[PDB]
């Protein structure tokens, strides 16, 4: 009733957010500062303010409906959140599986939207928002042609490496790792050149395509932006 | 901490047999990280078998391990001439390693006898102050055997030293000493000396004797 | 008296079955 | 080559100290792991102590904490194990070991040395005594006869015995050892046959290089205990 | 002549093309599976699948060529699908040229045919063709750099590491590696100054040269594309001259 | 009180700081004449030359603070010029703090107080003072980043591995090592796959980030420089009014 | 006189021009194409053409100077070239010193003319021409941080790594290596952590400095152009 | 009898000579 | 006898307790 | 460790072949390149092969231009040397060789084998004549004794001369042999005192493993040649 | 082709000297690439100075060498107990290594007098059907000695073998071996044969003889 | 005779002093 408008004048309270959000930089800065001789007197007590830190944040995540009862739900923010908030408290009372309790850090991308409080901040991210979905349709197209050339340098050069060669799940790793420049002349492209002499006709044209990939990119912001 | 449970302790195994070693421990562990070794006599081990589901450089194709959980097992199809060692089961854990306790094979075979000798004290030993009749028995199968010793009839028990073997590589056989130490006037108070064997092949245990004569 | 799921334990109050004693008795679930 | 050589060993009475070194031969020492591996004399095998590739990083168990030390140097390819104040419970043969994949702590261990020995004991450095053996006679002058060595009274371990300085190789049968009184007993024989002996004589040669002692004793047949 | 009308119809037909794109799509996520070392099994199973679409794709193109005759020799196209065809039809016969049957994973490239229509597709394109004067000037003033620099470093290391510079067809090689900044220093060079102390006079000047083109190329686009805009709206201050 | 004038007159003039000038770089010349391995017969040349420099610029630190007492404190170059002579009597008084005393060789940087009137600088300054803004914007931004990205790198791969991310004070420089592309694949991720075979799912799209990142940069200046020049002629078209 | 006229008739055929350029790109080919194991009796014909085209190009340069008696020494062209003409003809009866007789390429340069001659190829070059002396201006400040950051190396890593710190012209050197981003931590940086451990202190600033040179440098760039 | 250019073959029924039996009999040339 | 601290030494005369002899004797501190 | 194995061997006749290999250990291997030098029985070198790193780039001088043949592989670590139709002037000691500075042709060389010799002759396989030696007498009966063994007509090349074995090492003199009619002939002694001769007779023990040929040979103190 | 000229051929030295030794070649060439090499007997070669004006490792710092164009150099400055050995100067040229021909020192030395004896031919190798009338001549200095056969008067030198020796790294001495091979019979016709040694430092030849003495 | 600068040569008319046979005597100086 009127106790509705107490926690709307409760909840909007600025203090209470920059409060849970130096709480929550605690508990992300909790277990990782640990050292690796573990010493498991005081990791005990890392687990109980653990315990502690999610179940006031699920008192929070739950105190939230009471405010806004359809309108929390509208907004695509806060919603990927919840969906972590739910994911974090999976880990409370159920088996050890391990890579879902680490993703409890992410959730520092609440100040990102403090980051759109400041005015100097206002423009870059804006900037951003507004050029992602023109590199998203290069991404698409860049990866038709690794999946046209992958499958290409599989079949030339499974035979007798099979190492970073010998198959589709390996040989898209190694053709990314020779896309950013790094040691294709000294750790991958010699020591080919010592079984198929020719080999230099398919790698000198592939840096000729998806590093002048580069250009266009820059097209694309220079048009949007 | 992450401790181990072997079994069995010892298993003995006549060649071309498919037999089956077990390692267990107190709680769920994957599969990527769980090793085996392999221990001859006076050998440092050697890697054996790496993520329970593959062999190891040089090893023959004839062995093969699997489990998962806290079951883990190594299974042998045919066993060989040189496979009598000690194995082990290994497991990684929060920072510190872990290893099993040991299971040994040996090569059942076909009986013998043993070949018992009993030999009196050397003159410079007496001449010491001391003496020490030793009765060894050599090239026996199985490894557990018994001695008796008998001096003009009492059974004396005071002062013996029995020592065992390893079992043998060329024709899977044991050996054993018999120590019975005593000082030069207690060895010259009496004649006889005796040592005898109790085999499992013969119901009558055999004498090894020897007198005064010239002694 | 083994102990029950979303109750504390120790290293002698041990759990009942399907549970791990992770200073509480915790189900098990893959 | 890819070799491992363990220094040092011996004997400490207890409450002293004792530093080992391992030296590796052949891989690029600078890109691995190490670690100490101890086994018990009752065959049974105990972790130490290990150490990442740079040397900043350090792991013990909990019943060693904070008197064992490692160290490498990798401008000399070497690795240190410096001891000190030790226990009844430590007399053990120590090994060297290097890791499976590189980088990494805490995987197989692919690569072994050969075997340090460290013995706890407050006894004192004994001389063997070493005499041969001889039967008193022949059923029928059987072929098959036996010649025999004695070794009481030594200390500490090891000793090496040998027939006419390792001879023969076959129907020789060595013996463990017992260690009574801060001594240790062992005996062995051959099986040689009665037209070699005593035509040719054969000779027990004991090393004890603990307490630096040569010991040649060759065997008499049958010397009568007789006087007149 | 009714027969030439069915083919008429029925070839020119939107569900005939949208049954050989997705049949080549399935060329291609077959053509995909394999994997080495091998069981030999699957091999017998690759070669059967690699002549069954041969052979249908060869009943296509004479279907497709039967309904002209001077029309054909026309698109680049048809005459790229009927050189693919003829290297695997060379390949199935013939004995071992394996490794020139792998150009025929290309024909994917059709599916850009089909989405000539997507809106979105038309800014990127128009994009792309509104850069390349440019970069088809870069490559041959490149080229005439690497012309000059090669003979040069042929001369001077010539002799002694031959490996790297023996002729002027690997010093090519090596020097578009000591272009993109990969291991120049320690992997060419370190060896080098210890035999020739006075290499570092050769490789230092380079590079600033090629690095300094590459700049002018990013900011020659963002000049460019910004300049052209502007006169969309320069018009429009006519428009302001009744202002 | 004619010495305060003469101390005034003479102490303020361009013939002074000429020569100051011209002692810092004879400093740096006499300086930089040191090569290892040594003789030791150039060390106590040069632990005097230390000495007589170090009192000479303390002479002349004196005679500067002399003219005024309250003036000081003002600009940061004679506060940083009393930390450098303040550090070197520390290093010449106390036992080796040796290491200390290398901050030394920055006052060469006076010399940019000499060149204010040159027109060539101008532009460059006004240049360098023209980015500024998003720079530290993008630092800011990138170093949310990292402290996100660093700690679940080190709660993932902390047990194995410890030499690279065992704390968060070495996960922070392997995180700034794999941003600038050296050796990421052949040093760092393929001995990673080999134990924990999903490691490409963190590291891959960690670097699509940055350089994102990095290439907005670029051409956020290349447009906003570009922007306010338009401006300047944008006033003409109102001269275009009367037109 | 009359035949001045005539040489200035024979001397503006750019056939002629053509025919030397050929000719010169051929000169340079020859002693590129050889194949190191020398059978030195064509190679032997290889010295006589040599000599040969050195003879006419020699006849080219001093039979410029009938037409044009002073214009041709007021063109800043032809002036680097006639210094290398007469640094080819020094080898023709001297002692043998080379790094002088494989200058002889350079002159392909006289082609940039032709570069200018086409329409398209315009726009690049002035646009090159135009930006050189904002580049230079940043050239020479960032020598001077080269110069001040040497001296401070030196005396830190010259004890105890004499082999790439151990003076300042091989300091600068590898300093060098350490700014364009190559190997700086597998070779340079994390061998140095191994025995001063706050070495990354004097490194990470480094590349704070002189990789954001590239920022400002696109600057005076875009201001230019 | 050996098996001809363009015919089927096996393990069993190899090609004459100058070919490779890859699943029928195959011509060969540099 | 051992030179004070700021006193010049060389090889001969050494410094007192707790110095360096770094051409004058120095007191030193970690 | 890094050591060269240099396998092979032996003698050819004129017209035949013979394919050499050294097998390296330790170092980098795929990052240097390598040389092949010999030596004439008269000590005097001369090059005759070299291969860089990869195996694309070959030189030879001109005297055997088109003969020999130089092949590397990496994967096993190996240097092949084929070689055909030798001549009567390639009877040498061949050495396998690496260069010093690294990716580099023509420097100098740094470490070498241990050679392998190479003979080409016409004849045939023949087992030595072994006989002692002995004085005649002795002036006053001078304790300086000397004893001796001839070892004349074998070939070819190698022979090993010992006295009981490989016992003594000092007062013993090996000589060269010379080559005379397709067979060598060697000679040797050894100074002794006269107290241990004839009371303990040594014995010349020569091993020619080409013929594989073990000869054991005692002195016979001064045997006289009579006959009642 | 670039070709070397060394001298001397051969120098003997007493420890404690300072000597030199040359290397010279037809044409200027850098002193960046130029080499030496030290050989022992019976050890593959090893480097020993790098670019005319460095040691090796491990090479003792009393050597140095220097020079230019066509004049190179070595200078020893005080000679040791181990440095008899023979020495190589290396060039590299257009594509072709090039080595010298070797110079070689000796210890000198006091003089001494030769261990000489003559041996008759063993009995087996009369069976045989030959004879070898051996005479050793060791432990002298230097290396120059000569012999001579007599039979019954006559000066024989029909079938002999001479053989020389290497300097001693004991004593610095010399060894060498002189046999006379003839038949059975021609051994068998004649009563005396003498081997006789002319030494430097007495003008009389000392003669070493046997007899058909129960021979 | 000797060959003179600036005149053929090969390997048996040699230069005279100072000069190198370069196919032609040739005078040098560093």
Redesign the interface.
């Known amino acids: 009733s009127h106790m509705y408008l107490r926690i709307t004048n409760i909840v909007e309270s600025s203090f209470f957010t920059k409060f849970i959000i130096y709480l929550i930089v605690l508990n992300?800065?909790f277990?990782?500062?640990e050292?690796?001789?573990?010493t498991e007197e005081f990791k005990?007590v890392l687990?109980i303010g653990n315990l502690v830190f999610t179940g006031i944040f699920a008192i929070e995540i739950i105190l939230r409906i009471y405010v806004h009862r359809i309108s929390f739900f509208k907004d695509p923010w806060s919603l990927f959140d919840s969906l972590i908030v739910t994911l974090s408290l999976v880990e409370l009372?159920?088996?050890?599986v391990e890579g879902l309790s680490?993703?409890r850090?992410?959730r520092?991308?609440r100040?990102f939207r403090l980051?759109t409080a400041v005015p100097?901040?206002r423009?870059?991210v804006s900037?951003?928002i507004s050029?992602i979905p023109?590199?998203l349709?290069?991404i698409a197209?860049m990866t038709?042609f690794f999946?046209?050339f992958?499958?290409?340098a599989?079949?030339?050069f499974?035979?007798r490496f099979?190492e970073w060669f010998?198959?589709?799940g390996e040989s898209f790793?190694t053709l990314?790792?020779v896309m950013?420049?790094?040691?294709?002349?000294?750790?991958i492209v010699r020591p080919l050149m010592?079984v198929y002499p020719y080999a230099?006709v398919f790698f000198?044209p592939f840096?000729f395509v998806v590093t002048?990939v580069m250009?266009?990119?820059?097209?694309?912001?220079?048009?949007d932006? | 901490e992450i401790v181990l449970t072997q079994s069995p302790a010892l298993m003995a195994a006549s060649p071309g047999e498919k037999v089956t070693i077990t390692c267990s421990v107190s709680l769920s562990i994957s599969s990527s990280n769980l090793f085996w070794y392999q221990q001859k006599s006076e050998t440092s081990p050697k890697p054996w078998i790496y993520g329970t589901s593959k062999l190891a450089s040089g090893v023959p194709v004839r062995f093969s391990g699997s489990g998962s959980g806290t079951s883990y097992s190594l299974t042998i199809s045919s066993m060989e001439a040189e496979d009598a060692a000690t194995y082990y089961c290994q497991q990684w854990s929060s920072h510190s390693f872990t290893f099993g306790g040991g299971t040994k094979l040996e090569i059942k075979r076909a009986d013998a006898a043993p070949t018992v000798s009993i030999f009196p004290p050397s003159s410079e030993q007496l001449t010491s102050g001391g003496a020490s009749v030793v009765c060894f028995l050599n090239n026996f199968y199985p490894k557990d055997i018994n001695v008796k010793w008998k001096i003009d009839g009492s059974e004396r028990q005071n002062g013996v030293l029995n020592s065992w073997t390893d079992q043998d590589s060329k024709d899977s056989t044991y050996s054993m000493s018999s120590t019975l130490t005593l000082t030069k006037d207690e060895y010259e108070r009496h004649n006889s000396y005796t040592c005898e064997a109790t085999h499992k092949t013969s119901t009558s245990p055999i004498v090894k004797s020897f007198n005064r004569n010239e002694c | 008296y083994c102990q029950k799921w979303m109750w504390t334990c120790d290293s002698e109050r041990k759990c009942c079955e399907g549970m791990v004693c992770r200073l509480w008795c915790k189900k098990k679930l893959w | 080559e890819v070799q491992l050589v363990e220094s040092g060993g011996g004997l400490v009475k207890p409450g002293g100290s004792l530093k080992l070194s391992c030296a590796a031969s052949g891989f690029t020492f600078s890109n691995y792991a190490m670690s100490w591996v101890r086994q018990t004399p009752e065959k049974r095998l105990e972790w130490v102590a290990t150490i990442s590739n740079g040397g900043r990083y350090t792991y013990y168990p909990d019943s060693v904490k904070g008197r064992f030390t490692i160290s490498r140097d990798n401008a000399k390819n070497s690795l240190y194990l410096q001891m000190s104040s030790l226990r009844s419970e430590d007399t053990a043969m120590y090994y060297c070991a290097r890791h499976l994949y590189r980088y990494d702590v805490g995987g197989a261990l692919d690569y072994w040395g050969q075997g340090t020995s460290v013995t706890v004991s407050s006894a004192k450095t004994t001389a063997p005594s070493v005499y041969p053996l001889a039967p008193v006679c022949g059923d029928t002058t059987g072929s098959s006869v036996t010649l025999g060595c004695l070794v009481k009274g030594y200390f500490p371990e090891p000793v090496t015995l040998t027939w006419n300085s390792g001879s023969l190789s076959s129907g020789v049968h060595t013996f463990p050892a017992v260690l009574q009184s801060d001594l240790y007993t062992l005996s062995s024989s051959v099986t040689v046959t009665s037209s070699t002996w005593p035509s040719q004589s054969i000779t027990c040669n004991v090393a004890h290089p603990a307490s630096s002692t040569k010991v040649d004793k060759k065997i008499e047949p049958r010397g009568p205990t007789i006087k007149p």
């Open positions: 992300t800065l277990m990782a500062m050292h690796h001789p573990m005990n687990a009372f159920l088996a050890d680490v993703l850090s992410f520092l991308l100040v980051v100097q901040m423009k870059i900037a951003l050029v023109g590199m349709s290069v197209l038709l999946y046209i992958a499958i290409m599989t079949q030339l499974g035979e099979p010998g198959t589709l790793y990314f790792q950013t420049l790094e040691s294709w002349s000294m750790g010592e230099w000198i840096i002048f250009i266009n990119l820059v097209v694309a912001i220079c048009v932006a």
